[PDB]
Design an enzyme around this catalytic site. Structure first.
Site, PDB file in Angstrom:
ATOM      1  CD  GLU A  27      -2.966  -0.090  -0.449  1.00  0.00           C
ATOM      2  OE1 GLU A  27      -3.066   0.535  -1.533  1.00  0.00           O
ATOM      3  OE2 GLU A  27      -3.318  -1.287  -0.326  1.00  0.00           O
ATOM      4  N   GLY A  86      -5.631   2.834   1.044  1.00  0.00           N
ATOM      5  CA  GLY A  86      -5.125   4.124   1.497  1.00  0.00           C
ATOM      6  C   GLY A  86      -3.947   3.998   2.452  1.00  0.00           C
TER       7      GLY A  86
END
Ligand SMILES: O=C(O)c1cc2ccccc2o1
EC number: 5.6.2.2
Length: 187
Positions: A27, A86
């Site tokens: 991520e 995110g």
């Protein structure tokens, strides 16, 4: 940001078999790859440190550091603290996270703990360069059983990523034993 801490598997993946743990890295790497697809980042360095942290460094523009008019804090902090899933999810599940931005001549630095900034984004020096460095220490309250990063998992994925991102240098480094790889596809 607290719903994440209470039910992390929904957001990051299995927190007991190592899947979630390595997805934390990917991520952050995604953030750097976004800069490469927009054409601003040519080099990314992923480093496995010996104190159970991983850093991802890119040479893109750097995350914007000016104040967000709606939120009243730096845009960087907004990205790290507001809901790929995110980079704020990674921040939430990290007991510590170090953010270093090089942009517009200045080096900016900020520390978080469990998603909570310890101070405002602060200028610490001057720099010719630009780019984002994110280093995070996963929380052992969240991540259980599998608590070590595994080189081969990272390597396999980053190699896979180089082929999708032409002209992007992706280096993996392991400070635990000196292992080193370099994925640089140019076709
Ligand atoms: O210069 C910009 O507008 C810029 C740089 C950047 C890096 C990460 C995420 C968003 C971003 O926007």
């Amino acid at each position: 940001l607290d719903a994440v801490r209470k039910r992390p598997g929904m957001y990051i993946g299995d927190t007991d078999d190592g899947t979630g743990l390595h997805h934390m890295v990917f991520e952050v790497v995604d953030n750097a790859i976004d800069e490469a697809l927009a054409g601003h980042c040519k080099e990314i360095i992923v480093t496995i440190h010996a104190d159970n942290s991983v850093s991802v460094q890119d040479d893109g523009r750097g995350i914007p550091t000016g104040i967000h008019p709606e939120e009243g804090v730096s845009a960087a902090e907004v990205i790290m603290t507001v809901l790929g899933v995110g980079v704020s999810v990674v921040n939430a599940l990290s007991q510590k996270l170090e953010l270093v931005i090089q942009r517009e001549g200045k080096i900016h630095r900020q520390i978080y703990e469990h998603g909570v900034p310890q101070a405002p984004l602060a200028v610490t020096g001057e720099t010719e360069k630009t780019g984002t460095m994110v280093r995070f220490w996963p929380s052992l309250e969240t991540f259980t059983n599998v608590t070590e990063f595994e080189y081969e998992i990272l390597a396999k994925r980053l190699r896979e990523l180089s082929f999708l991102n032409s002209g992007v240098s992706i280096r993996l480094r392991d400070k635990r034993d000196g292992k080193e790889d370099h994925f640089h596809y140019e076709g």
